[PDB]
């Protein structure tokens, strides 16, 4: 009578508490290491990807961003790292980070033509061009705001208002302009000590421009500071301006909510259909652990920071 170990042949090993290399026959693996390598669609809906545009560029309607105007329903946002298009003008939008964070829970948009161009009074609006953002070699400007300028040496105070009627949460953007010196201000506009005021049911604001000298960036000595707000249903909003003003033309409307993510990957686009995504590639596996990158999107498995994990069974 001879009874003993179940004989087997093996090729790999495993670690333990008291040793580092012990051979094992059923070397079961649990860690996934291989990725496809190209960006691809999620759940059959094409994600939104940009090439050189930025969030500021897209929302503010950059002249070179014209291709992206009415983007349909998407899954997630993949914006090119270190955008080149971005904002051609050397401005600065207040609290960019909170806006970017807010954009992480929206799955659809709709542009609403709230304030028609013809509705504007005698106030001149056709001289708002800039050489910093050329189009086909010609001066141009943003395609989402209107820079009102004096006409016949006049500038009546603007007292527009708006009431939100549709059951949706509108989003509004506008801006203010910092000139360079006194003569420029009195040339473009009519009077000094300009101010703007915003009125709603939740906040107030009263601002004036800053006039001083600065360095030269892109051959310009002026600045633009933008601002934004969220409007509740059945609410009202009021604007007043005695001078410098960046009036809005198009508003944004939210119609769906869900899950999204801001992304900073570097790969091109392919034709596919996956379930998860990482900044280097897609995943088509079932293991519960991976170590490609901790910043995943979707129902991806968990992330660790190691190199070898074996849950093998068997003798030896």
């Amino acid at each position: 009578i001879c009874i003993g170990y179940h004989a087997n042949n093996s090729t790999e090993q495993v670690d333990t508490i008291m040793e580092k290399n012990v051979t094992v026959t059923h070397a079961q693996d649990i860690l996934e290491k291989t990725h496809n390598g190209k960006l691809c669609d999620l759940n059959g809906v094409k994600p939104l990807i940009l090439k050189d545009c930025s969030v500021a560029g897209w929302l503010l309607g950059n002249p070179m961003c014209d291709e992206f105007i009415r983007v349909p329903e998407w899954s997630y946002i993949v914006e090119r790292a270190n955008p080149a298009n971005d904002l051609c003008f050397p401005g600065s939008l207040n609290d960019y980070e909170e806006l970017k964070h807010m954009l992480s829970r929206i799955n659809h948009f709709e542009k609403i033509q709230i304030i028609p161009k013809s509705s504007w009074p005698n106030h001149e609006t056709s001289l708002g061009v800039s050489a910093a953002c050329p189009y086909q070699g010609a001066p141009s400007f943003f395609r989402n705001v209107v820079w009102l300028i004096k006409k016949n040496d006049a500038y009546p105070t603007i007292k527009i208002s708006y009431n939100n009627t549709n059951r949706e949460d509108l989003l509004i953007l506008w801006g203010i302009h910092h000139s360079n010196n006194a003569e420029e201000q009195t040339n473009l506009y009519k009077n000094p000590i300009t101010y703007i005021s915003v009125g709603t049911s939740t906040l107030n604001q009263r601002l004036a421009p800053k006039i001083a000298t600065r360095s030269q960036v892109n051959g310009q000595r002026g600045r633009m500071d933008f601002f934004w707000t969220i409007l509740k249903p059945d609410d009202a909003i009021h604007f007043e301006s005695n001078g410098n003003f960046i009036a809005p033309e198009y508003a944004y409307k939210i119609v769906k909510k869900g899950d999204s993510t801001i992304m900073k990957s570097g790969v091109e686009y392919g034709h596919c259909n996956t379930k998860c995504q990482t900044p280097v590639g897609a995943i088509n596996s079932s293991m519960p652990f991976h170590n490609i990158h901790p910043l995943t999107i979707g129902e991806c498995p968990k992330y660790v920071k190691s190199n070898k994990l074996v849950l093998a069974t068997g003798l030896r």
Partner: antibody
Amino acid sequence: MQLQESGPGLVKPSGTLSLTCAVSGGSISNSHWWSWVRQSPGKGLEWIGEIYHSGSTYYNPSLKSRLTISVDKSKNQFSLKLTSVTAADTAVYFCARGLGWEQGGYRAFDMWGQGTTVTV
Amino acid sequence: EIVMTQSPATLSVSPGERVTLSCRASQSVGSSLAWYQQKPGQAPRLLIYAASTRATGIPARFSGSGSGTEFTLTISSLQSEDFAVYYCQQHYNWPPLTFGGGTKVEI
């Protein structure tokens, strides 16, 4: 603008159709979305797909796996290829152009060509 | 997906009088439909692209309006060249920009 359609009149079943729409007078130098529309009896008008000048493409989900658009900057010629003709219903095809940014960029097909048919 | 359907099929009208067309959708769309009219042997031309604008077509002769899931065109006058086939489409979401059914108005 003079939008012209160059078709071969392909018939051979289990073949690969290829119609090449070329733009005259104008050129591919502005923001637009060229499109294909096919008209067939019994179901009217179907939208085939669109493609921007930078390389972005949108296809019909019905024939996405079998249809492909290509473009040529050299002489501004954009073409369609469908790899199987057994599903073709001898519909009449047209290549058309939408509106520019001055109109708000709505997805409507403004300008249309002469149109040409094909049979299997 | 969004599916389009119009109930009436054939209308028989006299010149100069008032006619209505109906366009009945399947889901909330907003203001994102368009209308097309086809002449025999010719490509269509644009008449209504936004739900409440008339930048394309012939002014002061046609009109269309609606919301929710129901839309309607009125003319209040028509000439000998207005008899054609009319189509209703949506453009609220991509890719499947499906087209509506056909209807024929004639003497």
